[PDB]
Design a protein around this ligand. Sequence first.
Ligand SMILES: CCCCCCCCC(O)(P(=O)(O)O)P(=O)(O)O
Ligand SMILES: CCCCCCCCC(O)(P(=O)(O)O)P(=O)(O)O
Ligand SMILES: [Mg+2]
Ligand SMILES: [Mg+2]
Ligand SMILES: [Mg+2]
Ligand SMILES: [Mg+2]
Ligand SMILES: [Mg+2]
Ligand SMILES: [Mg+2]
Lengths: 286, 285
Amino acid sequence: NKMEAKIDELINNDPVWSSQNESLISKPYNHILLNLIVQINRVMNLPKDQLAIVSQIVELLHNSSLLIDDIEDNAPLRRGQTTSHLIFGVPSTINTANYMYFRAMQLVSQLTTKEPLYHNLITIFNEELINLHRGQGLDIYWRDFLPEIIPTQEMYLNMVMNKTGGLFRLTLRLMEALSPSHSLVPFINLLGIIYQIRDDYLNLKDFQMSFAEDITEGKLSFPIVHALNFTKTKGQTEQHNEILRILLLRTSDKDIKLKLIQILEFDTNSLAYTKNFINQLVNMIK
Amino acid sequence: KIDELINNDPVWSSQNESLISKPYNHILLKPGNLIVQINRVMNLPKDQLAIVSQIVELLHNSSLLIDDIEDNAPLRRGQTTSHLIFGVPSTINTANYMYFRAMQLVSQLTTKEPLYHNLITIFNEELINLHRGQGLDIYWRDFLPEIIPTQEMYLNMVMNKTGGLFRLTLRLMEALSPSSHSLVPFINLLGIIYQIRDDYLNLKDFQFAEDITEGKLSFPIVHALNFTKTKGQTEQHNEILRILLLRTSDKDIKLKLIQILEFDTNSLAYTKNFINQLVNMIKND
Ligand SMILES: CCCCCCCCC(O)(P(=O)(O)O)P(=O)(O)O
Ligand SMILES: CCCCCCCCC(O)(P(=O)(O)O)P(=O)(O)O
Ligand SMILES: [Mg+2]
Ligand SMILES: [Mg+2]
Ligand SMILES: [Mg+2]
Ligand SMILES: [Mg+2]
Ligand SMILES: [Mg+2]
Ligand SMILES: [Mg+2]
């Protein structure tokens, strides 16, 4: 009866969860913790306690998405430090990241009571999280099943619209919806495309000038997509195949990585094409 | 084209949708209800009942895709696990994607905003509970031997972990029911019985016992370590810890652990009996 009584207590109450338990499971997230919203707000003009919550939400989603992305990308370093999954393990990191996505979601109701507005906010959250995963899904798929699919520039841009555009739009849309009041989404869409291609570009260019981890990862980056379609079109069979073989080695060898970068530089002219593309895009936004 | 591109919703084809769905479709191939029966009392319209079932189906299967990665499991329902076929990266992303697909189905449940908020909050709260309990199960396993849970700590972990999906299904139906106590306590007790039975059987069916290989603080193991600790049985206690920490696939070593659980701590019988008393709480109500 003494036991049957503890069981009765147990099942008749909400699950027990201590502040100690919360700290233990939060380790991966606290480790990775170690200005766009402020800017955008100069136009949206949201009261400050709402702006603070939009900020917590975007911060939880961004950091959590990086913990998962680093496991998905086999990344050794993030923000200058060892990635959380190498310290705490893949199991804990995945579970904590996923836990934080749901804590982010919980914060959405601290933004308002107005049932019409609430439904819209939750839909924005749900929509863009679906987008982010669809984009991340193709990015990973192309990479891990190469050469099953060789994306074209159009396929890559559409992937970036889902992947990169997801948190940019989530941030912008939440803020527009909370604003006492045309949409800046097309501008944020462009801003995100620039950001991603620039990221892909400098990952190689910084290396060529002096880790180019995107090559080790085997990612179908913007310059890489140009190089593979360029080589196919121009009948450069051997170069097409060598770009593929190197990507598939998942190599950390610095000379093999530089070889691939110089093929992009001298053989396909993918680096110049990409630098030009980014310039044409910045010109458009300006 | 850049102007077209940025002025429209992101493009996503059904072909793209099929690509990303492979890891999930894979776990769907191997079959394996309580819901239909309970509706005899909740009486949800058939269309809402289908949606609740689909929500629970997406969450359950996706959660198992993740659990198998976290547990380094080579087989699920007698078949190779999705992460060994499509890779860990795609499997995690697909599973997480389906969590959000499940979230989206919550809106097709009702138009009434008072109700809608309540359903999202139920969905949110139980996915939080699910992760809290899974995070504690994973923590004890991976930080062993830092913390050895007591039976009370284990049952609290189970209420969050296993109870999460059971309560989610039940609370969604109770919120949606057009009919006039709650079945939560019962579903909570069913969850506990379910978990302890999964832990008990993993070993008795051997007596593969993958739980040993995983190093999980299962119900029987929790009894064994707190038993050996309580009765100053130092060497037996450490031996249990040594085998769990080995992460062994060795049939002989595992049988050696089960043997200790059968004959020294008598944890298998302690567990079988615990289950019976839980079943008696219901079969005596
Ligand atoms: C569904 C989760 C999506 C998270 C997206 C995180 C992208 C991270 C990178 O932008 P980074 O590793 O250079 O920070 P990516 O290069 O696309 O892996
Ligand atoms: C946050 C997701 C939690 C999902 C928990 C799934 C538990 C699955 C098991 O019940 P199984 O591997 O025996 O099917 P567990 O023994 O606890 O890993
Ligand atoms: Mg990455
Ligand atoms: Mg990535
Ligand atoms: Mg990058
Ligand atoms: Mg498992
Ligand atoms: Mg598990
Ligand atoms: Mg199990």
